[PDB]
Enzyme design. Structure first.
Site, PDB file in Angstrom:
ATOM      1  N   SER A 166       3.000  -5.651   3.899  1.00  0.00           N
ATOM      2  CA  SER A 166       4.442  -5.792   3.753  1.00  0.00           C
ATOM      3  C   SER A 166       4.883  -5.403   2.334  1.00  0.00           C
ATOM      4  O   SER A 166       4.735  -4.252   1.945  1.00  0.00           O
ATOM      5  CB  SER A 166       4.884  -7.205   4.164  1.00  0.00           C
ATOM      6  OG  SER A 166       6.288  -7.372   4.009  1.00  0.00           O
TER       7      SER A 166
ATOM      8  N   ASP B  52       8.927  -4.537  14.650  1.00  0.00           N
ATOM      9  CA  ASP B  52       8.986  -4.692  13.211  1.00  0.00           C
ATOM     10  C   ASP B  52      10.118  -3.823  12.660  1.00  0.00           C
ATOM     11  O   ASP B  52      10.161  -2.633  12.949  1.00  0.00           O
ATOM     12  CB  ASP B  52       7.619  -4.291  12.615  1.00  0.00           C
ATOM     13  CG  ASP B  52       7.560  -4.466  11.119  1.00  0.00           C
ATOM     14  OD1 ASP B  52       8.590  -4.804  10.513  1.00  0.00           O
ATOM     15  OD2 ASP B  52       6.478  -4.272  10.537  1.00  0.00           O
TER      16      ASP B  52
ATOM     17  N   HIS C 206       6.002  -8.058  12.673  1.00  0.00           N
ATOM     18  CA  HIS C 206       5.640  -7.945  11.285  1.00  0.00           C
ATOM     19  C   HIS C 206       4.782  -9.147  10.886  1.00  0.00           C
ATOM     20  O   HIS C 206       5.049 -10.277  11.326  1.00  0.00           O
ATOM     21  CB  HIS C 206       6.911  -7.928  10.442  1.00  0.00           C
ATOM     22  CG  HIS C 206       6.691  -7.549   9.011  1.00  0.00           C
ATOM     23  ND1 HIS C 206       6.367  -6.267   8.624  1.00  0.00           N
ATOM     24  CD2 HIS C 206       6.798  -8.272   7.869  1.00  0.00           C
ATOM     25  CE1 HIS C 206       6.268  -6.223   7.305  1.00  0.00           C
ATOM     26  NE2 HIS C 206       6.513  -7.428   6.825  1.00  0.00           N
TER      27      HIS C 206
END
Lengths: 313, 305, 305, 313
Positions: free
Chosen positions: C149, C246, C276
Site C-alpha cells: 500500500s 481495491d 486492499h
C-alpha cells in the site's frame, strides 16, 4: 459507475422489508411483489387517453390483456408487452405505469399480456400464451385500430425472455408479423451454466434478484431441469437467423447483464440488426423505479423512441 | 460485446500538415453525410457575433411553429478538425426526430485559435441562441446543449460557463462520448483502447490534438479545459453516451457519477460493440441509429430531468 | 470472483485523533500477527542513521550464511499508521520462504513528519542496507525492495530515488497493491471500491491520509509523491500485486504497463475475490498465503528480470 | 492492462505463420504445434539433474510418462503434470521446458503424462489415463523416490481440465492421494454455453485459441456433443465438495478467463480452499512463452512455490 446514491437507500429500505427465502410459498411472494409494485405504479400516476381489458383465446384458455391507446387513429403502431416476475410473479397491474408511459411516448397502442404463471402452469405455458397473444394482435389489427404491418414485441426480465422467444416462434413458423423486438434485461440462458455477472451481482446485498430467488424461479418454471435446454426456454441456444431488429437494454449490476450482451452479439453474428446498451449504476428491474430513478426515465424514453422509428432497423 | 462485425471490416479498410488532416477528415465525413441522404424542412447559415469575431452557425428547422425547443450542437474533431458540414447528417436527423431547432456552431479551431477560443465561441453561440429565441422561432425556456467528443467537452463547459455567471438558459446537456479530462492522468480505458489497431482515436492523435489545442501543458488544469475537475453542483440534467471501445469511456462514465454526487440528475449509458465517434456512422451502423434516436428523444422529453 | 465468503464475514463484523486510530490499527494488526504464530531463526532491532535522525529497523534473519539476498520492506498504513510490529508476521514469513534477510523500516509517520520525510528514510534505510552488507551478512548485489500500500509507494519511489542518483543497488521491486497516484485524478476503481461498505480503504480515509501526509495539495504532483508520473526508464524489474476490490487496482495495473512501455520488465497480477490489504490476513485468507508465497519466490529467483 | 508490447509482435509473427482452418487434418495441426512448441523449448534450454521415460499400465493400454527429478532424495514431493493442446495436440515434448523449470524451482519430481489424444481416443480416454497415471504415481511412490503423501496434480489449458477432473475422480472414489491442484488457465466448461471472455478474446486476431479452433477441438474430443455435460468433461458442473486446495491461474485476454475464475469461486462456495490470480496483459498459453515473456517466468515461479509449500492449503 458505482451504484447510484439514491438506489443504495432504495435497497437499504428493502433490506428489512420481509426478505425472501427459498421455502416461502408462492402466494406470499406474489402478494408482496404486487403490493410493492403498486407503490411504484401509484407514485408514477401515469395518464392514458384510453384503456380497457380484453380476452384473447389461447391454446390453454382465455388470456387477459390490457390495451393502452395513447391517441386516436385507426392504423397505429402496436407493442405487445410481457411483464417480468420470474415466470411466477407479476401481472398487467404491476407494470401498468411502464406500459402507459411507453404508449404515451411511442404513440403506439401497447397490449400488455397476462400470461399464465408457474408453478401452476409450467413451461411452455407462458411461451404459448405469449405467441398466441402477439399473433392475435396481428390477426385482429382492425378491431384494435392498429397497423398489422407495424407490430413490435417488448418485455422486461422474464418478459424479455417471452418477447425474444415469441420472435423466434414467429420466425420458425415463417411469419412476418414481428417487426421489432425490445428486450429489457432479458433472461436468455435458463440453464445453470454461469457467467461472471450471474455470480457477481446475485448475492443477498442486491436483493432484487438473488441467487436464491433465481433458483426458486427456475424450480417453479420447469417440470424438469432439462427442459431449460429448449431454445424456447434458453433462446441464446436457438438459431438466431432472420430475427427482427433488436434493442437489448442491460443494467451494470445485474446477474443477467452478461447473457443479455451476449445475446445481442450473437444476433449480429447471424446478420440480425441488434444494439446492446448498458445503463450504468443500476440494478436489474431498474425501469420500474423510473419515478425515483433518472435511469428508469431515460430507459423508457429510449425504448419508446426506438420502437416509434424502429431505429435499429 | 466484441467489436461489431461491420465495424471490424470498416477499420480493416482504414508531423502531418493540419490543413491536410482536415481535408482528409472532411472527405471521409462527407461520404457518410451523402449516405445519410437526410431531408430537412428548412435550413440556413447565420453569423453569430462572438468575442473573437463572427461565428458561423447553421440553423436546422424541422417544422413550422414559434417556440420550438432548441439544441445548440457542437461538432467533434479533437478541437482541430471538423465543421458544420462534417456533422450535417447528424444535425438534420437530430432536428427531425427531436422536433427541435438545432443550431450547429462552427467554433474556432486550434492550433490557430487555441484554448480558450472555442470555449468562448461555444458559450457566445449558445447565449446568442438564448437572446434571439424570437428571431429563431424557438422557446427560450427549452434550450439544450449537445456535442460529440471534443464537442461534448464544449457542451459541458458551456453549461459550466452559464452556471458560473448565474445564467439559467442551459436546461439539458447531452454529452456524446465527451472529453472531460484533457490532462495526461491516465485511466484504464485511455490506455486500453488507444492503440494503432483502433485508428480513430489513437494515443498519437490524442497527444497531437492536445499539442494543437493548448498554448502550454498547464492550461489543461483549467475547469474550462478539463470539466471533470470543475465544481459540478447546480448543473443541468445530463445524458452521457459512451462507447465500449473508447479511450474516453471511463472519464465519461465518471463524469455522470460525479454529477450525481453533487445532486445533479444524470445517466450514463454505454453502447456495446462500438468505438469512439460511432454516431457519425449511423447510415451503416445500427448503434449509430439507436444513439441518434435516444439523444433526440431524451432531449424532446428532457427524460433525465 | 465475488468477495470471498470469509472476507464478507470479516467485513460484516467490522476528525478522529491520529493517536487513537494508530492504537486501533495496532490492536487489530497484532491479532493477526499472533494468529500467524511465525517462527524466525534470528531477529534483532537496529538503528539506521538517517537524514531526519535515527531510523528504527528490524532485521529478520531466516538462516545462517554470509551473502544472503536482502529485501528492504516498507509497511503500509497510509503513511500515518502502522509499524514494524503491525507487519511482523508478513516479514518473518517472507524471510523464511525467500531465504533472504528482510529489513523492515520503521519510517517516519505523518502528520508529524510530512512528505518527503518517509521518502528520505525509505531511501536512507535501503542504501544503508547496501552500504552495510558485510555487517548484515547479506550480498550487496541481491537487494530487493518491497512494501504494501503506502509501503509499495515508498518501495517504488526508493527505486526512483536510487535511479536518480545513478545508484544501482536496487535490483528488484515488489509493489504490493501500491499507491502510485496520490493526486485526486480519479480512476474507475478508485470510485468503485471506496464506499463505506468496503471499510479498509474508504474515500474518507484516503482523503484523510492525504491531508495528513501533505503540507499542501500541490506536493502530490511530485514524482516522489506520485511515481506514476515519474520517468520510469532504467528502473529495476517489478512484480505488482493487485487486489480485485481495491481503489488502487487500476493505477497499480497501469504502473506495471507504463514500466513496460519504458522497457522495464514488469508483471501485474490480480488476486480475485479480495480487498486492499489482504496480505496481512494470510492466517485466515488463502489468498494472503498464496501472495506471500508468490512474493517470496519471485524475489528468490528474481523471476520477472 | 493492454496486450504486452512484445506479445503483439509475437502474435504479429504468428499472423502469416500458416494459419488454422476448420477443414485442416489433425496430422498437420499436430505437426505445426509440435514444431512451434519445440522452438520455445530449445530457446528455454532448461537443465535437469535426472530425466527418464517410463511406461504406466492404463485401462486403455501402456501410457508413457516422463519423470523429471531435480535433486537426490527418496521421499520428494511429486507433481503429476498434464500438457495442454485442446485434447488433440501436444505431448510431453511440447511442454518439456515448463516441466524442467517447475521441477527445478519446486524441488518436486514432475511426472508429465502422455495421455491419449482425440479424435483417435475420444472422451473419456484421456481422463481415464490422467487418473490412472496419478494413481500409479501414488501406488509406486517407492520406485519413484517420492512421498505418497505429498502428490499434487497440475496442468495447462486442456491439461488443467485433466488435473481438475483427476482430483474430482479421486474425491469420488474416496481417495486421499491428490493433496493439491494447480489449474493453469483450465477449460472447465466444454459445452457451448457462452461467457463474455469466451466471445471477447476468441476472434482470429488472438490466434492462439480462436472460436474456430475451440469448436474444432470440441468436435475431435467428443463422440457426441451431449458428452460435454458429463462432470468429467465439464467439471464446473461437478459436485465440488472436499476437493484439494486449488491455485487457478488465468490470463487477461483468454477466452477461458471467466470460467477459470468462476471455477475458483465455486470451489470456495463448497468450502474448498481456492485462489484465482489473473495475469494481466497476456493471452491463453502464455506460460510456454516464458523465455521471452516475463509473465511466463513469474507464473512458473508462482506455481512452483505454491506447490512447494502448498501455500493455499
Amino acid at each position: 459507475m458505482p451504484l447510484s446514491p439514491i438506489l443504495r437507500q432504495i435497497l437499504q429500505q428493502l433490506a428489512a422489508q420481509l426478505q425472501f427465502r427459498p421455502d416461502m410459498d408462492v402466494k406470499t411472494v406474489r402478494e408482496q411483489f404486487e403490493k410493492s409494485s403498486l407503490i411504484l405504479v401509484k407514485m408514477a400516476n401515469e395518464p392514458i387517453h384510453r384503456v380497457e381489458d380484453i380476452t384473447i383465446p389461447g391454446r390453454g384458455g382465455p388470456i387477459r390483456a390490457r390495451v393502452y391507446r395513447p391517441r386516436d387513429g385507426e392504423r397505429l403502431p402496436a407493442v405487445v408487452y410481457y411483464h417480468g416476475g420470474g415466470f411466477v410473479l407479476g401481472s398487467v397491474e404491476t407494470h401498468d405505469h411502464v406500459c402507459r408511459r411507453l404508449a404515451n411516448l411511442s404513440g403506439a397502442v401497447v397490449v400488455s399480456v397476462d400470461y399464465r404463471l408457474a408453478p401452476e402452469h409450467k413451461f411452455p405455458a407462458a411461451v404459448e400464451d405469449a405467441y398466441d397473444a402477439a399473433k392475435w394482435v396481428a390477426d385482429n389489427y382492425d378491431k384494435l385500430g392498429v397497423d398489422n404491418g407495424k407490430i413490435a414485441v417488448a418485455g422486461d426480465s422474464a418478459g424479455g425472455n417471452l418477447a425474444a422467444v415469441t420472435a423466434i416462434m414467429a420466425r420458425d413458423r415463417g411469419e412476418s408479423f414481428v417487426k421489432y423486438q425490445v428486450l429489457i434485461y432479458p433472461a436468455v440462458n435458463l440453464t445453470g451454466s454461469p457467467t461472471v455477472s450471474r455470480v457477481e451481482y446475485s448475492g443477498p446485498e442486491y436483493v432484487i434478484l438473488t441467487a436464491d430467488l433465481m433458483a426458486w424461479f427456475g424450480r417453479q418454471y420447469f417440470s424438469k431441469p432439462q427442459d431449460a435446454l429448449s431454445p424456447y426456454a434458453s433462446p441464446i441456444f436457438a438459431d438466431l437467423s432472420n430475427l427482427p431488429p433488436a434493442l437489448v437494454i442491460t443494467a451494470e449490476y445485474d446477474p443477467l447483464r452478461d447473457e443479455g450482451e451476449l445475446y445481442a452479439h450473437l444476433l449480429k453474428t447471424r446478420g440480425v440488426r441488434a444494439v446492446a446498451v448498458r445503463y450504468n449504476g443500476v440494478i436489474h428491474g431498474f425501469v420500474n423505479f423510473y419515478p425515483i430513478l433518472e435511469e428508469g426515465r431515460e430507459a423508457v424514453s429510449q425504448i419508446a423512441a426506438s420502437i416509434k422509428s424502429m431505429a435499429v432497423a
